Assembly symmetry: C5
Homo-oligomer: 366 residues x 5
Amino acid sequence: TVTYTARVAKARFGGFSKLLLLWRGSIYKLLWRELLCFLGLFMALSAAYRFVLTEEQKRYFEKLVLYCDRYASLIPVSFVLGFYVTLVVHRWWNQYLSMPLTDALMCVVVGTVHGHDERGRLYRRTLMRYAGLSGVLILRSVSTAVFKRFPTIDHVVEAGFMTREERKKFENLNSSYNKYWVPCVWFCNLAAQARREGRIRDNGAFKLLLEELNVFRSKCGMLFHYDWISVPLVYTQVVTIAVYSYFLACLIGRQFLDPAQGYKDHDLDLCVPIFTLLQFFFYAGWLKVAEQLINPFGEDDDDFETNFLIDRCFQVSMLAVDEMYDDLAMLEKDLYWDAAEARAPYTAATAFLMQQPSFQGSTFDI
Amino acid sequence: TVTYTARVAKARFGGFSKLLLLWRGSIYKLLWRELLCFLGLFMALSAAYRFVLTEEQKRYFEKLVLYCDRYASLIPVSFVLGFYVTLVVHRWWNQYLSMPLTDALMCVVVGTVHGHDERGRLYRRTLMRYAGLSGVLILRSVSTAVFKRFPTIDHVVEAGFMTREERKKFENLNSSYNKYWVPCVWFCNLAAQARREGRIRDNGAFKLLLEELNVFRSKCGMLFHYDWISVPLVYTQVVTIAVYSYFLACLIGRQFLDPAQGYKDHDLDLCVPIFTLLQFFFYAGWLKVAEQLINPFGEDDDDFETNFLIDRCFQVSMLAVDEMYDDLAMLEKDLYWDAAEARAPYTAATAFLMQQPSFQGSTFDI
Amino acid sequence: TVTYTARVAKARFGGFSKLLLLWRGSIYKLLWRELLCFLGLFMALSAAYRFVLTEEQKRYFEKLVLYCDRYASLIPVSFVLGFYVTLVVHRWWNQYLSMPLTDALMCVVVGTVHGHDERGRLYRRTLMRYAGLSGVLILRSVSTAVFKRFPTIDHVVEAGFMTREERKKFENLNSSYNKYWVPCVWFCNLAAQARREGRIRDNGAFKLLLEELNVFRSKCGMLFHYDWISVPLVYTQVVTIAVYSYFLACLIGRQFLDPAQGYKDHDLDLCVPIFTLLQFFFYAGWLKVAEQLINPFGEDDDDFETNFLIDRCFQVSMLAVDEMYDDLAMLEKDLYWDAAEARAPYTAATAFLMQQPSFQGSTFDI
Amino acid sequence: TVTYTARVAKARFGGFSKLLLLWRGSIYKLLWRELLCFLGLFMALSAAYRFVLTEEQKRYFEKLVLYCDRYASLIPVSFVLGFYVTLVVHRWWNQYLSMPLTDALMCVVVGTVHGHDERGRLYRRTLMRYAGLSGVLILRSVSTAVFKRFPTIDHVVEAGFMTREERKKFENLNSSYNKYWVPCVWFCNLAAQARREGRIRDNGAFKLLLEELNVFRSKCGMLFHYDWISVPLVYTQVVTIAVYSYFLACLIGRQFLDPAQGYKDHDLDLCVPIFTLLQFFFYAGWLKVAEQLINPFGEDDDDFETNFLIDRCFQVSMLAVDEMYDDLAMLEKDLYWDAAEARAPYTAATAFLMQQPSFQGSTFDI
Amino acid sequence: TVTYTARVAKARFGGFSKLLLLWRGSIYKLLWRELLCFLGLFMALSAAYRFVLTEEQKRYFEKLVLYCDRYASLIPVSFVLGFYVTLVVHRWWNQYLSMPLTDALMCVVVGTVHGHDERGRLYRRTLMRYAGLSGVLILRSVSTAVFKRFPTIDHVVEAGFMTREERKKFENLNSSYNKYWVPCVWFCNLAAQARREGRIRDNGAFKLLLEELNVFRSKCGMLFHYDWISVPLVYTQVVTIAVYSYFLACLIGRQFLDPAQGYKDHDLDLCVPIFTLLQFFFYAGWLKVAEQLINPFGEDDDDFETNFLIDRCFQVSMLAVDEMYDDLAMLEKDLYWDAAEARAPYTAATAFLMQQPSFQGSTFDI
Ligand SMILES: [Ca+2]
Ligand SMILES: [Ca+2]
Ligand SMILES: [Ca+2]
Ligand SMILES: [Ca+2]
Ligand SMILES: [Ca+2]
Ligand SMILES: [Cl-]
């Protein structure tokens, strides 16, 4: 992922303009090859027209240039691009929201699975490790970076996510389908065992744990669904054919004709179609947005950082359920115990922007 | 379904371009018949104009070609296509999300319906078989492939989803409506019986089972709703009439006229309207996207694999509630029991991409 | 409703094309009157131009035709149509999802309200009859067909939805607002009474019943909201004025002028503006989609079958809570009790399409 | 609000056309002033061109008319109008869904807060009065009509929503923010007191009451959010500038030039630009849709009837929790106690439309 | 934020027109610098054309002006602007809905965490202070204004949100990730301790507290997600390149040519391209909407008032859980205890608008 929200915190004079100077995850890094290809074909065709082609053939070539320029439609391709890219962006954001995150699970576990002893600590750590393991399994199924990090289940075992005995139980299961759901079933069994053993004190807490487990598992299933069910291939081919047809039309129809013929709208030759190159940037980049977001778990610069999320979730969950279990500072009175109003101070840098009348409603200025 | 998300993992130089070489579920497999039809009529009309028609009639024909070319509107049809196809894609994705999946139900059942004996195992297996049976009934009601797999309720009985006695109870019910809901009512009765018999230990667990059953059943009802309530026929006819009207206008208005008349914008004859064929690919394929997704439970290559989902759900649910019930590896300390940080290693292939500073927030680089 | 999803199960050569041959709920049944009106005015104006008008007045008339043709904008009306029709379709689908359906309620009732005796059966039947009655009341408030089926509350009483005593309690309430909510309050009181009497065994079950009752009632309230709050009249008038203004411009601006004057783009007279008639089909039908879906509870062919849904819900709910209460086939072992894999057979018609490698993930083909 | 869904129940020959004859909440009532202004400036400019301006200045004026007509872009403004109005309509509908309605709360209260005595009745009435009071407070904060109905908190006290003692507690709180949330905190305290006193019998019921209270309060907070956070002013200014720029271009560029000069596309003078007036209706009304819906709690004819909703909710909630508490007709057998099928009769007006085969699925006609 | 919903309460004659006179958060405050830049380059180029350039070079310059005017496409950029700005507005509103608000938490705490003594008050205050602290941590991570208010964790400690001992526990945790989640884990531990100590009376109440805590924490996580995952940089660059390419085309192609050459569509020179300046306002402001909303936690005038929300939430939560805990006015009969109807009076200003027949349904006027 490429984060630039710090740069665009305000609508400045040169806010979006300086974003064109970035390289990592930029339009240039995605297009420059197609840009050089389009420029190469355009320059080769222009050179052939200027030198190689006969005078007789040049009249036919320029008539074909006019014909190809008449059918260069830039408006209709904008519709198919807008709709297709909007669908791809919707899928991309929903895919990000489906990342297996264990924050809800860690909060429930640290608040419901009890015991300062070795067994309670084993319960909490194993409950969160099961969710981490199912996250790792689904992500290595869907993400190329995680798969290269965990090429085999042996890599998962050496990483500490799954144990030797859990590995034997995992491989002995007779199923031809992806087994990312297995640690979730293990989580359900372990939660039921903890409730039976009294580690979970109340019936509500067990229900809350299974509700939060099914939310986590549904996110894993949704990542599998997005991975399996692509954007329909026919629609991707339609947008690609529209864009490539328009650019093939622009390659010939926008060729610089000899001004000596005096054809209208073609009485100039700048030997570089800079406005056609700007249109190429526009439409080719608009397609490149979808081409980068269509599978957001690849190795694009703007693709999701799945390995970082795995590491963060594992470390934070272990910290929260093990070192932070029932480890609280003693209850004491805050700065505003005796104060009628509870208001924090402002720094010298924020006071002169703040201290303004508080909004009470639209109807109170009558 | 045609899955190609592996191919588009990155925005490559030839990423979307190579997707035009695929055949299964492609634009070509859907259009080539209409493509040959349009080319046949265009070539026949051009040949009649060149040879059969009189010189006097050819002036009238070319005037009619100019008239038909003036009304060839390619922009307005793009709007109706964009909106209609977006609605169809919304329905298509929501229909996929309505597939009867039993993962949530299997997690709740394995965590709440207890007993290593024959009766507890019968309870778990039958509870998941009821959900599987209702899934099979709704899918054979909505999917052509599942219907050809289960042409009669006898096929459902031989498949093991429903028993002889359950079949007699099923057929004896006096109702003229689809009975896909019957196994859900059986599930509710069986869950209540299990709670009464003590197989479900706590009141919360029974509530969680009925909540998850009503989610499963609502998905079945939603598939029935999508099957019954089509995209409004008037709107489908509007988009079809717009596309076919535009292509009838393009068939005549884009006819290659004799250059001897010297008509403007018609001083060339390539005997093949390749740019009109590219526009045909574009608009006809854009309509074909909706034509393929309007009923995603048919036998199109990109249609949903309902039989595979039935098989996967049945096998996985039986495995999870029967062989995985209370079958856990003993609780043991993980690799990071004594480690302050819980972090997994990286392979040689991922280390040189990873090991980058972790994102802390937009405001921490001031 | 007009269901055609069986016809469009696959993207065939003549898939959408044959949908233009349907009549029930089609574009033709909605437009043919406006079509005849537009053709009548066009033909009358053309005949007046050809015969009645003087030679001197014909120059002014053809200048006015050119002027009216210059302002015939077909692109801008497409935007207002697309956005307005998308809003209407969103409201139409959300209105369908708000239909009062009692499947969730019947599942909860059959699983929570107990007793094989007359009193338990009365409890279950009356609980579902209250939800049915509130559904009937809201639907007769919003649907013309249901209102013609239940013109008075006497018709509701004779239909068996409400009793004589319930009628007296209903009419004695002092309120000037629609009383569709009354049976929901009766449901809440009856559920509380059943819990107090021990018919509902557990506290969770009572909470689940009130949660499912409030979902049912919110759907009834949402139907009332959609009925009360129309699509804003100003926006409907804007779309109607845009469409009618464009068609008034097309009626005159597309008039066939006498070729003897030699005006450009008007050197032909086919005495029938077939391309203008196709554009009429397009835009008038696009408006007709909204005109049919704006109130989906009327008597249009594609409008919702509210009476059928009332009958289905009543019959199915009574069956589920009365004849299916605790009526289960005895627990027995299924076909796959001893099988490691639980897989159903395939018919001869589906085997040669199926038996393909199961999708495991995008990253497993490296 | 202007309700016309009865008129548009069917797609009739003159369905939407007769909606142009309505006045209350119509396009005419919103535009006629701007319409007269635009016509006044157009007629004054045309009269000045015809009479006051010199012959020499008229050539410059008509050149400026051609220049202003060349930049009159009607397509691009349609995009900004479509997107902006769609956003405003989304906000408008979501604002309607955020109205503080107490139906869910009344159902829970009547089903959970018990006692036929004075204290139980006081509990139920006060619990619903607290929700009503918070609704009144937020609505008088956001709605001009409710504010004019309750200009002071004294008006709230005289209306019976808040008492003298509750008023003293309300004013004594030290906070500079809107106190619409205060009755919700009172509701929580009163519910906890009722549970402690045994008026609420079960722990689940208390949880259901606090869940329904937080839904009600979130709707109040969401109304406050919509009131505070306007549609971004920059975007409103963009749409206004686009529309006004286009209409300033149309005021001059569409001026009727003298036909004596023989300028192309300007060889007529109808002294009234009726097609420009129709375009004014279109674009100005499209902007007026947003201008009316941007704040739906004002005094527009199509604005929400907040006072009516306050009255309805108060009266219905008091009726449901006080007169309908545990007031049920005795349980008796319905018309279909002995009938295998539970089906209601049809009137003579609906039988000949109904009695059609019931939809069973798409796959059952093979 | 700039609130103007009071001004637009009604669709007035000069409603949106007077919004163009505002300055704070207006289009002018965002664009005037780019406006002066564009005018400066246009005037400099026009002056160079008029004076500095030779007569021979002026023919080439005006041919280049015609060439650049032919490729000035204002329609296609409208599509990319509409779609991109709609995505940005969707993200902006969802980001506002993700603000950490503690109203739901305060209602649950005041209704579930009991005790008039010092320990119960400490419990309630600390529970709400933990949620406030996590809100402050995430907001100072995402908002520039909050970061300038809390540049260090020392500022958080002096503000009273976190204590000395809580600070030592906070810093001693070994994690390289943002620790905004830590106070949520503390909340879970404190809630579990309160339930164990009997401060929370019932098991349901503890579950409701953890459910509301996970909603609060998910909102904090969602703010972190929006901060980390920007709108894809490629798409922002595409929209910026399209807008800047169009304006570079308009800078030259719309240059006022010398009328002495008699070029068509260029026979005038107003030395100021006011219609090009209006188009600049339109497109540049449309981009500025996204440029301001892309990061809504900056210091733009229309950006969210995060500091005000922190202050409001802290003060209101402390008031609700401390001064309002079990502090109720005694239960007494309301104004409508003996009244069959519960209806409030209307003021003289609202009666003559109100007192209209109540909407009962669409079907009751037959
Ligand atoms: Ca900003
Ligand atoms: Ca990618
Ligand atoms: Ca299909
Ligand atoms: Ca209708
Ligand atoms: Ca308004
Ligand atoms: Cl619950």
